[PDB]
Amino acid sequence: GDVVSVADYGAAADSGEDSAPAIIKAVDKAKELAAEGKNVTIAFPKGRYDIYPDKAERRTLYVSNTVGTNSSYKDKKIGILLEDTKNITVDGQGSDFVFHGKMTTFAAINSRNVTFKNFSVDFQVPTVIDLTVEKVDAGAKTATVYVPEEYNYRLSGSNIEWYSDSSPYTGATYWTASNALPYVQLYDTKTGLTVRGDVWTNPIFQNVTGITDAGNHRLVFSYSSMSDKLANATGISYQMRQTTRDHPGVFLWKDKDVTLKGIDFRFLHGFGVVGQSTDTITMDGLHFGTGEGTGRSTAGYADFVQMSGCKGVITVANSSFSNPHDDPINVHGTFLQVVEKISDTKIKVRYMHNETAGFPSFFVGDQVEFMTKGDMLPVSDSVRTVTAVDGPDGQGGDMGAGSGSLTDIVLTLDSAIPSAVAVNSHVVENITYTPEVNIHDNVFKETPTRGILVTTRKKVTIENNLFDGMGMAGIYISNDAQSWYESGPTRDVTIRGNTFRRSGSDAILVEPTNPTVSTTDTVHKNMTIEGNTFYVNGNRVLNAKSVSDLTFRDNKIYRENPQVSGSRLFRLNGCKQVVFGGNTYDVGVKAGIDLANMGASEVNVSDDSAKVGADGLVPVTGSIAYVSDDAAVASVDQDGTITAVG
Amino acid sequence: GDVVSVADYGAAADSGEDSAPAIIKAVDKAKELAAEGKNVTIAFPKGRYDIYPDKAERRTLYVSNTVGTNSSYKDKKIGILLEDTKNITVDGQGSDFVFHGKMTTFAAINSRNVTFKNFSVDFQVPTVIDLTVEKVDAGAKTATVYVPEEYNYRLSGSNIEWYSDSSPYTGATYWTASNALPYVQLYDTKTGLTVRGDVWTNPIFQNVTGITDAGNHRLVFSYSSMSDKLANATGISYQMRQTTRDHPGVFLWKDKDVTLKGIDFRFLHGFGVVGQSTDTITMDGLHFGTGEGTGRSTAGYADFVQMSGCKGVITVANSSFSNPHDDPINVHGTFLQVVEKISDTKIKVRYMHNETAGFPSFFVGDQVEFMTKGDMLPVSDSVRTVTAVDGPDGQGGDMGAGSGSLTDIVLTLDSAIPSAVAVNSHVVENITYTPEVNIHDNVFKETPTRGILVTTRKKVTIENNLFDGMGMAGIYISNDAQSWYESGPTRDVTIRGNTFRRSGSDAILVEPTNPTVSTTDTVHKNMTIEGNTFYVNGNRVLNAKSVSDLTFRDNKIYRENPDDQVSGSRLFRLNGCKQVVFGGNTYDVGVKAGIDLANMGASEVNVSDDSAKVGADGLVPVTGSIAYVSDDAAVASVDQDGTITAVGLEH
Numbered sequence A: 001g002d003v004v005s006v007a008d009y010g011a012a013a014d015s016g017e018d019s020a021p022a023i024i025k026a027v028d029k030a031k032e033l034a035a036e037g038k039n040v041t042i043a044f045p046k047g048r049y050d051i052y053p054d055k056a057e058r059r060t061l062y063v064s065n066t067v068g069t070n071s072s073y074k075d076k077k078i079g080i081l082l083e084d085t086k087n088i089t090v091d092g093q094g095s096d097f098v099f100h101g102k103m104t105t106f107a108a109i110n111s112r113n114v115t116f117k118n119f120s121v122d123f124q125v126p127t128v129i130d131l132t133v134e135k136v137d138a139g140a141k142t143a144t145v146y147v148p149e150e151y152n153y154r155l156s157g158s159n160i161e162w163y164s165d166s167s168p169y170t171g172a173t174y175w176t177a178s179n180a181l182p183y184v185q186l187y188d189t190k191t192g193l194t195v196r197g198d199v200w201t202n203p204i205f206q207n208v209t210g211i212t213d214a215g216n217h218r219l220v221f222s223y224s225s226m227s228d229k230l231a232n233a234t235g236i237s238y239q240m241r242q243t244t245r246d247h248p249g250v251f252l253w254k255d256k257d258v259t260l261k262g263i264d265f266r267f268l269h270g271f272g273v274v275g276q277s278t279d280t281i282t283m284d285g286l287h288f289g290t291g292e293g294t295g296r297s298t299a300g301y302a303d304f305v306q307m308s309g310c311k312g313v314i315t316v317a318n319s320s321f322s323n324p325h326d327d328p329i330n331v332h333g334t335f336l337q338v339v340e341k342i343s344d345t346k347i348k349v350r351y352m353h354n355e356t357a358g359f360p361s362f363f364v365g366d367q368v369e370f371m372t373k374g375d376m377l378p379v380s381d382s383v384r385t386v387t388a389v390d391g392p393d394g395q396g397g398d399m400g401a402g403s404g405s406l407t408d409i410v411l412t413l414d415s416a417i418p419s420a421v422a423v424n425s426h427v428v429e430n431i432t433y434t435p436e437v438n439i440h441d442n443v444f445k446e447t448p449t450r451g452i453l454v455t456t457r458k459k460v461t462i463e464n465n466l467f468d469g470m471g472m473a474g475i476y477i478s479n480d481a482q483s484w485y486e487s488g489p490t491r492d493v494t495i496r497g498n499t500f501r502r503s504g505s506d507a508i509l510v511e512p513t514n515p516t517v518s519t520t521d522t523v524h525k526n527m528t529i530e531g532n533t534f535y536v537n538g539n540r541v542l543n544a545k546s547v548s549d550l551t552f553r554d555n556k557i558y559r560e561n562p563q564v565s566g567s568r569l570f571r572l573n574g575c576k577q578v579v580f581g582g583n584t585y586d587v588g589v590k591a592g593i594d595l596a597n598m599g600a601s602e603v604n605v606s607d608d609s610a611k612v613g614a615d616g617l618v619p620v621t622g623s624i625a626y627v628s629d630d631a632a633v634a635s636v637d638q639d640g641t642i643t644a645v646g
Numbered sequence B: 001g002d003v004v005s006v007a008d009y010g011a012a013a014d015s016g017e018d019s020a021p022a023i024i025k026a027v028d029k030a031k032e033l034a035a036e037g038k039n040v041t042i043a044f045p046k047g048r049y050d051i052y053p054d055k056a057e058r059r060t061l062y063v064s065n066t067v068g069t070n071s072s073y074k075d076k077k078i079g080i081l082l083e084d085t086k087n088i089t090v091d092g093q094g095s096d097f098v099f100h101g102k103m104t105t106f107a108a109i110n111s112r113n114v115t116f117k118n119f120s121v122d123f124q125v126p127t128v129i130d131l132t133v134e135k136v137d138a139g140a141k142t143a144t145v146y147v148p149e150e151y152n153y154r155l156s157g158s159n160i161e162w163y164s165d166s167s168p169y170t171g172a173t174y175w176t177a178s179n180a181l182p183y184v185q186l187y188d189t190k191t192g193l194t195v196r197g198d199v200w201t202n203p204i205f206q207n208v209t210g211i212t213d214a215g216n217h218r219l220v221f222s223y224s225s226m227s228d229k230l231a232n233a234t235g236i237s238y239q240m241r242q243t244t245r246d247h248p249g250v251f252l253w254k255d256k257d258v259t260l261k262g263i264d265f266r267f268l269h270g271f272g273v274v275g276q277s278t279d280t281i282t283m284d285g286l287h288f289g290t291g292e293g294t295g296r297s298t299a300g301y302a303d304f305v306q307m308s309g310c311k312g313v314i315t316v317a318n319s320s321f322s323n324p325h326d327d328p329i330n331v332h333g334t335f336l337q338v339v340e341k342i343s344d345t346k347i348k349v350r351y352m353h354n355e356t357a358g359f360p361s362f363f364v365g366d367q368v369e370f371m372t373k374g375d376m377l378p379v380s381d382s383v384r385t386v387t388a389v390d391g392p393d394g395q396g397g398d399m400g401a402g403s404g405s406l407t408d409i410v411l412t413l414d415s416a417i418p419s420a421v422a423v424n425s426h427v428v429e430n431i432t433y434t435p436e437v438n439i440h441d442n443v444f445k446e447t448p449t450r451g452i453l454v455t456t457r458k459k460v461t462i463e464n465n466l467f468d469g470m471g472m473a474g475i476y477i478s479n480d481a482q483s484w485y486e487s488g489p490t491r492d493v494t495i496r497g498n499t500f501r502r503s504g505s506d507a508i509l510v511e512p513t514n515p516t517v518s519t520t521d522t523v524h525k526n527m528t529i530e531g532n533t534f535y536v537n538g539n540r541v542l543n544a545k546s547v548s549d550l551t552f553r554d555n556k557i558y559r560e561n562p563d564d565q566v567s568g569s570r571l572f573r574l575n576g577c578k579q580v581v582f583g584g585n586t587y588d589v590g591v592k593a594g595i596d597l598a599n600m601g602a603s604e605v606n607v608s609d610d611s612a613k614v615g616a617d618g619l620v621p622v623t624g625s626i627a628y629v630s631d632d633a634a635v636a637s638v639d640q641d642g643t644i645t646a647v648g649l650e651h
């Protein structure tokens, strides 16, 4: 089909000029051709392109999991915007896109069969400031801090004043900050592990007396007092930032069949890639991670991939994720709480978490289901179809008659709702906007939080991924109408063929946040965890709450560093019909199962070495153990309990 | 009956002279008459009697829960010893006995129907040193410390040197120490609560730069800096001591029908009242606590009452317990571990904890039962009778052939032991030496640890007691072959009509220490908790592990401070229990009448006749269909499971 080259609309490769106006003109041309029925490629002759926010498209938008209703951030600048169109591929052809200030890099709204491919994404001055403590001198009370080339600063006594680049149009500085930015997390240059410590206390900026420029991108800080934190800082990168998610990194809203492939995300400001009310998104060969040509380490200001209230198939494939400041992937919807029963067929529901509000979670024709918050179980026979929606449209206007509030949506339903549905005790899930999820052949590393969060009732496959060094659970499946109000329950989860290394916590945590644990129904159903390799070092493999038909089979559990310290490998809390079979365990791990809110009759270990209600410490295999005559023998009984240590 | 007066053997009441020799002479006379079949009273004309260790009876003795085999402490001085006799009553007639140095106060060994009554027990210089920080001055970096009159000290430099009184025979001081003794616990004079903090770090004695005598029993300590601990020390009494239990406070070994009554224990050195392999001990009207005529606060160097491997009936009645340095009461036996199967009818068993060893836990004719340590369950059909014993006799000699070790006993059994019994995996309990227990109408306060420990298969009744301020569980029922090796499983426990106030932890904790939670049989059986009152403030009422036939009924649960998602624990936790019934309990508004479950499902728990909720908070809402709420208070809406659904402000 047709090719639209940005060079024909004012944007030369490697020009040092602002390409934002030319890109708008190229997109306008592409949409003209697409409206005639053509398949269009917007091509970027390979090179660097700078994209500034000043003249970029501006839209009022309410974006899941960012800033909720906050009027100070409701307007977004968007570097490349495909709006109300179809059949357009943005082909960077290997170009490097450099964005400026605070803005969204690219976005598609109300569009179908759109693709973004083959470019890198970066910011001139990233809004996460990565400072590495290269050496500390407790005697002189100094610290030598490496400041990457990208950042601009002015020294003023004991103060350092950070600033971005400036607008070419007005000379205004896009942003400034002073000394320690609000949040900091820790990347150990030695181990490659990223963790959250005390995120609100940066030891670089504690008791500073003066700063001097030692040249070659190094500063020397001087301190009145030498705290223990600072004394141990050698080799630690302190990655600091504001936490306001003022823009999504990428926004895919009310689209259908979106593809992102072959994109190198070297830095995303504000948030990650946000899919919202979109049918089918494919993410293939994405690399979230700083390049070779930078001393920076942060690639994400927050999460990498957020798929909120989507449907169709969400695919994440052949991609890598390194150093976000929050979870790499979260696929979820939003529970809204019943706050008024207007009639048997009409209810007002409310966004209860202050970072998710202001956009539609319901359209006419969608199906919804009601849940009781306390046990997080569905109301029997509570599926209804939406026949009218009055509330925010996500752009500052009204759907239907509107609701008068960015947090409230009035729904009319096709028949009377169950009489038990009441204000505050019940929430509503849009069950039409639940996606199938296929996350396979990816690499997750340098992550302080969880690896993957996924909560959908459709088919979930998490397969052949490597999780290396997740600071919290590798995979986390919740379902929550307590703090986060993220739906929904799972019905078909397969976790297969993954490897878990250097787990900072449980490898797999299933923890819906219901305070009431039902002993007769479960929140989640039909979960299979098979063929995985778990390297363990004192944390659990599986900690699962309120799952029925849970199978853990044919996995391999190895000690990472090959009376007994560490947790039993397994914990089950209010589960039903649990089956263990065919797993292999290294000698010396606690292949045992802690039980909460349930008895042993619901756990079948007849085909496995794991022990219910005991340590299950795995002894040497066979009837004869070969032991050095200078080593001690710990005798292990048939439940995996040590009886004596010589 | 005949009377033997200590005043006829050289004792002079209120003389300050050593009465130990006169007491020995008087006991020798009483034993003569007792052997003639007479019922004898040994009488003390009312007054103060001083009893020194120098000329007191000395006995090699191995004493449960003190120092085990340690040869440095095997010999005990005993102020009043009834040995190998019967039908003797020591009647103090209201006298005050003051002991000196480090010694056991009184003891009865291998004696029948003996009584001690009607005296107070104290030490000239107690071996617990109670120091009260009365004032702190952060700017001056000083603390003003009250030192009770009873203690002797000298200051040298920034050091304080403690010393006892001196022997009247040799002139030598019985003991000395400097600065902080090894262990300290905290009595808050404001609240009456006693706790353990960092017991190995005394803030009075960190960073001291000077000590000044300020007169009237006060010292001013000066410091190079003021730690947060010391800054907040005002009104806290720091009760410090060594921990070596070199003597039992009282020792009742191999007796039958012993009575202690109307005794005021103002201070016991070394350990508490120890019953050991004794059949029936009655304790009635005992008051463990410092009197009103001292500034001291510690009454016990460690525990108050230890009944180790006894049988018959153990009664503790009408008594009070204030400020020990360990649990007021522990009734238990000792598990010994199988360490050698010599034949199908002969085994060697071993004392595994280093503070309990060197004495017999088995006698010919006793019955024993075998347990698997992992799940702490009995081995089926494993009750056997002892036909021979080779091991320590408790005073440094051999029973039978001996065993060659103070920790090891060789038992011969009447028939072959079960074949599943093996070395190390199995332990033995003497089930003959398991007592009935009746603890009633007592008061427990000012206690940093647990109130009552009891592990016996015989009938247990804990009834109409007051527990106020226990730092740890009020009642603790374990059964342990893991660290402490204290037996045994319970079969008939009733906890009735008690009141628990200011509970530092769970009110009642049942926690055998089996690492394996058997899914079939329970460690404990038949436990009824009824008619008690629990004042609660965020801790649990009942935390029970591995009990079958557990009934919690007709109790009253009140909020301790009736002015105030939700903080505090659910009131109940059950771990591997069976056939549990809750019924007829009453709960104040705002308590979490909910039940946490571990290693068990909800169908084991019958709450049909109760408000408690399984697997939910069970927060108790305002009673009735109308709630009267101030229009400046918020409403928290509570669902049927006791879970909060919303918190308003707008009603």
Ligand code: NA
Pocket (backbone or CB within 6 Å): A086
């Ligand atoms: Na088309």
